[PDB]
A paper describes a structure:
The envelope of immature TBEV particle contains 180 copies of each M protein precursor (prM) and E forming heterodimers. The prM protein stabilizes E, preventing premature virus activation and its fusion at low pH with the membranes of the trans-Golgi network (TGN). Flavivirus maturation occurs at mildly acidic pH, when host protease furin cleaves the prM protein to a pr peptide that will later dissociate from the particle and the M protein that remains in the particle, resulting in infectious viruses. Our atomic models of the major viral components, the E and prM proteins, indicate that the pr domains of prM have a critical role in holding the heterohexameric prM3E3 spikes in a metastable conformation.
Author numbering:
A (entry chain B), B (entry chain A), C (entry chain C): 1 to 492
D (entry chain E), E (entry chain D), F (entry chain F): 1 to 82, 86 to 95, 111 to 160
Write the structure that this text describes.
Amino acid sequence: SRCTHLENRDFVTGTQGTTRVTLVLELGGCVTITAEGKPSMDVWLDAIYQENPAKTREYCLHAKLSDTKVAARCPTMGPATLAEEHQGGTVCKRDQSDRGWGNHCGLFGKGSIVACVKAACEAKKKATGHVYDANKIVYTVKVEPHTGDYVAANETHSGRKTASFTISSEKTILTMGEYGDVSLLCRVASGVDLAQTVILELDKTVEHLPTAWQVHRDWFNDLALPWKHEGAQNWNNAERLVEFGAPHAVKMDVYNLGDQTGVLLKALAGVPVAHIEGTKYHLKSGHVTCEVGLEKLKMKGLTYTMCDKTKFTWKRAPTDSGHDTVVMEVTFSGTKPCRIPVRAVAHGSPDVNVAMLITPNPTIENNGGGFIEMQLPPGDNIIYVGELSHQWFQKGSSIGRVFQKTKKGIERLTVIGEHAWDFGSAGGFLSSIGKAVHTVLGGAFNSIFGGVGFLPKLLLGVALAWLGLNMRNPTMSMSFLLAGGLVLAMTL
Amino acid sequence: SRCTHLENRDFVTGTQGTTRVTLVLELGGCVTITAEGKPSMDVWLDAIYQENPAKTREYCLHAKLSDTKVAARCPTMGPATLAEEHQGGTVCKRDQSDRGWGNHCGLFGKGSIVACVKAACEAKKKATGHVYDANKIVYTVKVEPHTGDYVAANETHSGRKTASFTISSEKTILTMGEYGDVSLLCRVASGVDLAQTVILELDKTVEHLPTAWQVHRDWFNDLALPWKHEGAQNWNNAERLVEFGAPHAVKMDVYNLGDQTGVLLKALAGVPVAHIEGTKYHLKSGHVTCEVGLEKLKMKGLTYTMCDKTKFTWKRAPTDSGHDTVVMEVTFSGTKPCRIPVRAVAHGSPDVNVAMLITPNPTIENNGGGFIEMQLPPGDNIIYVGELSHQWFQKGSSIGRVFQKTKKGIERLTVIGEHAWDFGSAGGFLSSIGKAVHTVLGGAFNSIFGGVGFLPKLLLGVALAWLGLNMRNPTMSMSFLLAGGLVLAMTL
Amino acid sequence: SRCTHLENRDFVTGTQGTTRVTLVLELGGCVTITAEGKPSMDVWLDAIYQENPAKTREYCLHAKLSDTKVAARCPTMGPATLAEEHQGGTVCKRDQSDRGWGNHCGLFGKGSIVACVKAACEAKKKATGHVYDANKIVYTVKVEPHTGDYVAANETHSGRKTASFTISSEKTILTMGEYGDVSLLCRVASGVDLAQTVILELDKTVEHLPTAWQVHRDWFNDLALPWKHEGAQNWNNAERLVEFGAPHAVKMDVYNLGDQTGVLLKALAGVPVAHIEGTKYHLKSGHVTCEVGLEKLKMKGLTYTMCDKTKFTWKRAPTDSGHDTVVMEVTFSGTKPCRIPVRAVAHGSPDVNVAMLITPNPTIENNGGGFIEMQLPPGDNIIYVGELSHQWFQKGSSIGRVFQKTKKGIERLTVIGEHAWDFGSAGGFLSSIGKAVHTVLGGAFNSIFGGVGFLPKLLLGVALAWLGLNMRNPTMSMSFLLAGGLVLAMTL
Amino acid sequence: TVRKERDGSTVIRAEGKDAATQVRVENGTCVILATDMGSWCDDSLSYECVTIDQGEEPVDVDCFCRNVDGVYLEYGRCGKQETRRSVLIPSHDSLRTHLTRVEGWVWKNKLLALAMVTVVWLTLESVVTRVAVLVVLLCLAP
Amino acid sequence: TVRKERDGSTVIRAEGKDAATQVRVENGTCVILATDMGSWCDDSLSYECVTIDQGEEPVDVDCFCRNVDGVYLEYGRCGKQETRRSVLIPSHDSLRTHLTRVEGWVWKNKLLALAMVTVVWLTLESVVTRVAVLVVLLCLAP
Amino acid sequence: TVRKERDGSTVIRAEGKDAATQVRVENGTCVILATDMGSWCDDSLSYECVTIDQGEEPVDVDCFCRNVDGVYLEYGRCGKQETRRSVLIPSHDSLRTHLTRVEGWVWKNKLLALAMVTVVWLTLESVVTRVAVLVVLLCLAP
Ligand SMILES: *[C@@H]1O[C@H](CO)[C@@H](O)[C@H](O)[C@H]1NC(C)=O
Ligand SMILES: *[C@@H]1O[C@H](CO)[C@@H](O)[C@H](O)[C@H]1NC(C)=O
Ligand SMILES: *[C@@H]1O[C@H](CO)[C@@H](O)[C@H](O)[C@H]1NC(C)=O
């Protein structure tokens, strides 16, 4: 499982008789779906990207002059003109210059002089800019099933499947070989203000690293440099990269300010570098709110028998997985394929099944298997794998687990509630209340009523309501509220 | 007199049996002084000026470069040094030049270059800036004695006299010749802060106009041009009028920004043109508050006999002068000199004199004479000079005259309030209060009290005091205060 | 006598019947040990110095470059290397350099180049430092007797002696000639943070001054210059006086920053030159808390004859010394040797003298003799010497003297704080308390109480104790503390 | 080096080695004077070459010819070792911060926080709702 | 024109007509490519004239002399017609302001205005003269 | 001067007068262009003198030799008229001190000075101990 490595891993449990489960997915985070009687999946957001974003405006730094010219006429003999004065891609300035005996003009006046030059800036020195298109952003969600095969932190499970998600496309169903189909139906978003973020990338270069940034629009839109739009030959306001010298009679020089790559790079020090891969422009924010339909899954390898209980050896001893769960790799030697009889018993009760398996029906296939992940109650206990037996104690302390589940539920409600608010009518209000209650206390209700069942839960709710109906102080009325809450969670 | 042709005229007349009167003199505003049994005099602040004001700072507008040199060295051979670099009054810069293959430098790179030029800007182009000094200002106040001769606005009376008045000088005596002497005790004061205005003067060239201005101190002190204080030849901050061209391999040209008087003229359009002539710099904001003494003057020609009864004719018919007075010119054909007989009566009351001549004891001289100025009560107005009869009807009311005189006196006391009140001690405060009260109530006392005498005025004051002491509400204190003020005015 | 010309003078009087005196010495201060029937010594610290302090580290201000080498290799040949790169005593930097078709290296790009030169600095330019050692310091205190000859403000004294003191050695004995033996057991304390002072001594220069300095250890330990400890051939961190030129293909010059002594001198303006005397290094702040012995001092000339009262004449009139003392000198030219029957009688009390002689039994010797210093009570007094007479009065009051003595005692006890008391044992604490009380109240007891005797002291103590136990206010029992203090002072 | 174009004018084509020389054209003499030339390439500057009378010297020019009309210069600027001014490019849990901000405000607003706490504890009478009131009182400051 | 300084360095004091000439100095000869000369006066430029080998040509130089050492060209820049830019020097309701100034003082001192109003309201108790008191208070902050 | 070291590499010991001349080594020749040489000393800057073919002119090279391989230059630097710089060397009763600071603190808190009395004279009413309390309060402020 690729989720046995990430620092943050949210647990979501499939309640008994449940076929739908909501989710919240964010970058660098995965949620291990687990449901009773069904295989456990892994769901996470691989990466968010856009492809071939639109180009809005490309500044260029190193201006390249060419074919400059001047022209002047004797004083009081009409202004001077130039064939290149009125054409495009030019930067022309007018001025007056002294004159006298050495200029072959009679009177000691001051005539007109004109000087200007083509301005098309140097190639491979442009600073293009792109802006994301909100509706075209593509979100990638990849779902992996649980198999007994151990997976390294940087290895790809063969069964990994991918899925694309945009604003328009909503519902898509995947296939996972023999396990079945997972119905993904997600709604997307993007926290970063796409209107206030323009990606700036200067033309490809080997020495210059990095070659991309994310900058505020109100800054990239007011750079004191020449600027054009893609598909235009001439450059607007090219005069910002040419300095005209003083006139000497007939000639006035047109200088060049050189490239500006140094100044631009200096001005962008300490700014994030946007991830780029070929034609894919990645992002770094946003989250996907989604629901998964487990209805179409089938548990794998259920026809196999059970191997003998004396042919097992540890290859990776039990260790803390960082999320209050255990992981162990066991290698078999007898006939294959078959199931893996694994059980755990609390110290002092050596004849009760206590393990909460995460891997679905751990099995050994023709070639592959033996990775088992489990959750155990607080305190010491013994893990049984056939003949083998290992000692272990859990640090969770139950109450901490319940509190952490409540905190995670509150966080999920805060993150996802911004969009899941229905108040259209009485039905809408009821749906919103039910969704809030579920997203808040589903884990609490499941843990509180573990294996009790529907009829036992209804009986408990009825007893609590009857107790609440008894007359008492106003604070004592909370018994009815608790009974109703339990009934709704045990009946909805 | 000269003051018959001016708008701002004030009849500051001392009380009956008075020997001195306080004056306020504002440039352009005459004053007429009269006193029973004495000749009348006219005074006015002719002009305020300072001569040879101190000069604070000098700017120049045309640099005069000369002896410019240049030196260079190949790369990796140290900097370039010139003797002129460490001298005084030199402008120069250190740069680098692109030495290489064609300049016979073995190693390609940048080499030092220095171009240093002696800078001492031209003559007849300094923009000298003078600063006014309060202490050394000198005022001039003419004194024109009334006679029988009409004077045009342009013509100057032959008997006119002049005097000087500095802040330090306090007492001066003038000689009127035949008319006696006048004692002036003038206190000078400048009504504006002169430290915040500096007169800017280009070097004296009469090619165009103007070549002098008054400018705000800050603006003249924040001019972007070379500036030197008097005495140190080296021009501080001389770089402002020199620019260095781009450096070639071994040659670095040093241009000159050229003349800059034109821009300074273009930047001073609409600024008042400072009015100066010779070595005197005039002003436009000032006033001298003087105390004229009228004790040594003697009326002229008191022994002259009556003129002819029938040999009197009107050179110029009586007309208003816009100053609540009437002008009148006559000729003569009988024996001269002789005193002019003049009188005025009221129709229906042909035995009452209402002629209060402004000119004292009009007389006919062998050369000149016959001018008459006087004021008549509103209503019936008849003139009896010899046998000539003229019909006049002056507008206004005596109440109007009293109100106008009171308003003018209050305004005059407001202008000289700085020196019209002394708070150094108690006796000085009492003296200042008494002087202010006298100034305010002089017109009222003179108009209301005519020929009253000591006994009638004393009886009226006693009656007013008794009225103040009479039984009445506390609001009657105004009557008692008025009685006290009238008594005080009569006493002085 | 000698230190009568000094400013910071103190008087320490030993109680009758006592054979020792505690004392404190500091720079620029004197002391006048005085005891009944014993010669009055003078003690005053002369100078504190160390012999050849251990030099710590040396900065040399002019690196004499020599034997510089260069080598380079163009790209596709690996980084350049040189033999002297890893040799000691050499410094160098590796940098890129340009290449091309012009210098035999076909491929373009930046190569590698190294240029290493030996670093050493010639003599006469080492700014070697120095640091003091706490134990090695030597303190010298000079003790001289009182002879009746006046001594100039700079002339020496034949009879004076000297002694050296350090933390290691404590006790010692002197011999003044015919006067006796003075034993000093001084324990010294270094009064400065010697750990934070160092002498930055420029090497010898005959004409240029100065050479020595004192600088805070942190500054001298932070100078940005090459440094090494004596006995090290290399120059650690020698890159501070070498700047490398630009990389020109293969050449890379290694310039020299030149002499730095000018900058160092410019950076030590207004720093006190450290006194140097031969091989002795002088401190400037410190003190000695010494104990003076007086067991075997003998006064001289007790059984001389008496000069005839008539034959006497003055040489210097009495004058105010400056420490509430009267300095007088006489010269006699008759039969010798003898005694001077000095006496001063308070006005109105011709029989009672109130002059206590600082000079022990003033005497006329073959050489010298005649200088007499006296301390007298305030008021009008007549000084009698044989038949000579003079009229003299003092300033201040006896209360002033008591207050000054108390203040001096407080100051003396304050400066010996580090070694004034100890609580290791009860007896030691009691002894320290007694010593402190004696130090603080000895002058007060001596001035207030003189020659009373054991019986008067016992009677006073008994009477004061009885008064304390008598009726009084509950908080008005300060008489008890006063009696206790008086008894403790008079106990010895 | 000398080409006669089809427009009725002659263009002198110069290399770096040709600086400060005299090249004959048609019937006159052109004396190239510009000195910043280089090996020919795309970057070619071509400016009018002045023509002057017999007795007039040139000023403020670097290409003049005599008794020949309509001459243009042209030379590349590549190969020569290489105003390089550069343009100016300016550079560039949820409630935990709120709780942190509240704690910082309390720490740096000790007086106001103490006053509010004292007011609450002296006029609350709402121990049940005291926490509710204090929460708003403390969180109000922003 | 040619000279000889005391330090052993020649001085080719050129003039307007020497442009594009070939002056002969000592054992060698050399030229003057400068093209902005004029007459001679105080305004005299004097820069080093490079010396180059036979197998070389100048690059961005105005004077170069071969087979001679230490040649300093020197020419006067005056004697011709006028590069120059002028420096920038700056050029040189009776009750309207009072109401605006008072309103500004009140707005920037709303506490002062409130205190002034409350004074008349409570302590002064001068409703009849409250208008006068308020007017005086407003005039107290012109 | 030339000499072949034991390693098989030749070294040229140039002198001050050898500037811009030729030196013949083995069968090839060397060219010296350095203009910073001088008499021999310990200040010897010996660096590689790259050798090139006959088809390319030297670039950015002071010494170059043709028809020879492995030749090093070396020369002294004394006897030559002179670049310097300078490194940065930074430039180098008790009761009254407390009493002065206390007086300053009192004078800078006139309102606090009044409040001190307004509090002591009312709350303390223990002048004998109120003096000590006020002294402690005044000394509390640093
Ligand atoms: C996974 O990574 C390790 C070390 O990074 C490497 O040795 C191993 O080969 C990688 N996995 C595979 C399948 O190569
Ligand atoms: C003064 O002006 C009048 C009229 O303008 C003229 O007739 C007369 O001649 C003038 N007199 C003088 C002295 O200018
Ligand atoms: C110093 O001593 C000498 C003789 O040793 C003496 O002549 C001189 O007067 C002394 N100095 C003073 C200031 O008295």
